[PDB]
Amino acid sequence: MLKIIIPTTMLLPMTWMSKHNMIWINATVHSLLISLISLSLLNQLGENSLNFSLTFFSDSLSAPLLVLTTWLLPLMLMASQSHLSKETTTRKKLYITMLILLQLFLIMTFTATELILFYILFEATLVPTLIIITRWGNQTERLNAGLYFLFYTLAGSLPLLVALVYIQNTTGSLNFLIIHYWSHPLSNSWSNIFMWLACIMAFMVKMPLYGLHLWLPKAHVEAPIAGSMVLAAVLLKLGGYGMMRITTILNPLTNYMAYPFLMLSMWGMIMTSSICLRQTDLKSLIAYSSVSHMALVIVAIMIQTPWSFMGATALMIAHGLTSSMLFCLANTNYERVHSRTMILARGLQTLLPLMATWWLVASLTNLALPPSINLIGELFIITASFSWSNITIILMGMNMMITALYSLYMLITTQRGKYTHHINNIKPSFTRENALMALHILPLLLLTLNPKMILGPLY
């Protein structure tokens, strides 16, 4: 596993000793090479995980997430260099350093064998994101956003830490293999109920669960483009992955402790999809769409079935790619017109045809068109939910409708109609932007040919 970690660490002195006009080229090339190397973790076993050492291990759940992280770094670098051109050399290197440190923390987080190490890296991911949002965000709200991003996370994660150390006092270990092999049922007691809540609520906040989600619209809207890309594509999944690891010690308590969270997820999925229908800010719409998809992921993890776990893994990967692409698409128009109001710039298909094609494909994957992996995950989760209770289809189907209704709505508002007359500074699409869209969209489509590679351990 060090064959991934050490090159990522070497990215830091490489960017700090590069020429002033070579930082982007070097960082992009070497992050792409690191992604190519990380692509070898996809060879998984079935029976058990790849246990490299006492500290790091790779699973069929971890490997797609690691590949997505390593692939997302070069895309973030490509998307950042446009609006950071006027920046000084030192601050550009500091921005790249924040991105590299975030990738390093995420890579170590997804492969830690022991739950305290996972928790420490899980919290360590906070600091670079906070610095990125509050230093390179554009508006005055970013500061408030940063605070919301911070104290929502910590207020959830501080109890988890306590629970974790408590567990190691009674079990004797926090190694995940030992935890899984020596797992014992949780009795029906108040102490067990509160330990369950302490083990779950941090990942709930990270998802975010409906009702604990107010930090996400602020943080994703106010962040720079690379911040939004990493926040939506990878950071949210830190919750899901965490849940998939920690529910192994929460049975059979989850059989009834999950009812309020399931109700919140289903109803708030309806609520956030409906919120997307009346949204004036284009980034806010994408953020709320992420909330709805993550609610579906929460339902999948809470019902604890192999089909639901497979669907949750697939949906996590697919949503990461799609939401990153949508954020980049919105940022292109924002850099055109310096406003996030969705109705300001209209009829853009007339002026930017290829970018309109990119918009269309992103909207199609957002509404889960078959046979995309978005629908693969969604359908697996819906089938598992139907087995859990047949009435769930009523909500699930409703969500589907609303999702399409807002997706095309976005597409119709920004691409169709007539162009705004007074906006006359809409330049042709750069090769950088088109390449970024392609590098988002093509892996997503290729994953359809080999879906099992993202279906997780339960496959």
Binding site: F105, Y119, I120, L121, E123, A124, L126, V127, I131, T134, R135, L143, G146, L147, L150, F151, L154, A155, L158, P159, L161, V162, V165, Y166, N169
Partner: protein, 347 residues
């Protein structure tokens, strides 16, 4: 003050602390405290002004009352057992009086009122000394009598100190009062784990001292005592504000920084004693300290405040006096979490 006289007074303060920490006789510990206070009063008034005089008077009144209570507790303990050795107090009333006297000396709630005012009234070097070196002697005495302390009283004072430190720090624009409230909260954290493990108390003391030394040295380097004065430092020394922001993040306890290691070690220790509610409340309350650290970082390094024209002149001059241990202090305040097991060397 004459430099020779200043050196003599500093060495007398240090000698009082050493006398406290090497004595086996209660009278010699008391004498060490008296010597420390006697030499400490002029150091607070080195820069003469009404505020320094008021701070020295408040400090002396507090410490002299605490010393009276401490001698009373010693005498009661002697009365109920003809013992002068500092092992374990034989009378519970004497133990309560001794605990209150030591809490008053440390500034734990509800005897915290003097800590901000005095810290505001003195210079930054005097504040550095007051918030780092002055904690060693009472904490050492508390460590020696740890088995005798009543857990309820000590834990009540510790929780109150954490809560009051967070709440009081939330309201401050002056940097010295911010440091004082931070000190009160950290003292509460230190005294919470004392009845369970004194090694954790020592570890927390060392980490807090390192971070406090780093912050005071960074504040002396960029001669700022208010938030708005510190907001000018980015336009003269950006590296200083960056280092200050990282150290502030460490003080808030965020991982993977060093400031996380003490709390992590304390909560865990408390869970070995079936204590869950108190560690949970303690962390959730330390969130307030993190909040006002974050506000200071917002005003100082993460954004750029307006500056003044005369700052241009300051661009032409370097810092005359260099701090030798500031780089080591910053590195120790941030990057020592991977060396956590080394704490076994502290027992």
């Amino acid at each position: 003050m004459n430099p020779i006289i200043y050196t003599t007074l500093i060495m007398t303060v240090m000698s009082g602390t050493m006398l406290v920490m090497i004595s086996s006789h209660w009278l010699l510990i008391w004498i060490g405290f008296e010597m420390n206070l006697l030499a400490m009063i002029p150091v607070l008034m080195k820069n003469f002004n009404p505020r320094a005089t008021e701070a020295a008077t408040k400090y002396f009144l507090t410490q002299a009352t605490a010393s009276m209570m401490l001698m009373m507790a010693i005498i009661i303990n002697l009365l109920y057992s003809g013992q002068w050795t500092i092992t374990k107090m034989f009378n519970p009333v004497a133990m309560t009086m001794m605990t209150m006297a030591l809490a008053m000396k440390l500034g734990l709630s509800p005897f915290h009122f003097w800590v901000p005012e005095v810290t505001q009234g003195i210079s930054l070097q005097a504040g550095l000394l007051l918030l780092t070196w002055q904690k060693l002697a009472p904490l050492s005495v508390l460590c020696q009598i740890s088995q005798s302390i009543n857990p309820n009283l000590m834990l009540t004072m510790a929780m109150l100190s954490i809560l009051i430190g967070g709440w009081g720090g939330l309201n401050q624009t002056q940097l010295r009062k911010i440091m004082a409230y931070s000190s009160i909260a950290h003292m509460g954290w230190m005294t919470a784990v004392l009845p369970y493990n004194t090694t954790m108390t020592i570890l927390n003391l060392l980490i807090y001292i390192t971070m406090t030394l780093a912050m005071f040295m960074l504040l002396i380097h960029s001669s700022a005592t208010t938030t708005l004065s510190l907001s000018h430092t980015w336009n003269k020394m950006p590296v200083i504000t960056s280092l200050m922001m990282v150290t502030l993040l460490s003080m808030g306890g965020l991982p993977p920084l060093s400031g996380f290691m003490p709390k992590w070690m304390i909560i865990q220790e408390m869970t070995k004693n079936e204590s869950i509610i108190m560690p949970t409340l303690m962390a959730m309350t330390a969130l307030l300290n993190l909040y006002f650290y974050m506000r200071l970082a917002y005003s100082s390094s993460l954004t750029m405040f307006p500056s003044t024209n005369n700052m241009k002149m300051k661009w032409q001059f370097e810092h005359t006096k260099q701090m030798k241990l500031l780089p080591t202090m910053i590195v120790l305040s941030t990057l020592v979490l991977p060396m956590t097991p080394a704490l076994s060397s502290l027992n």
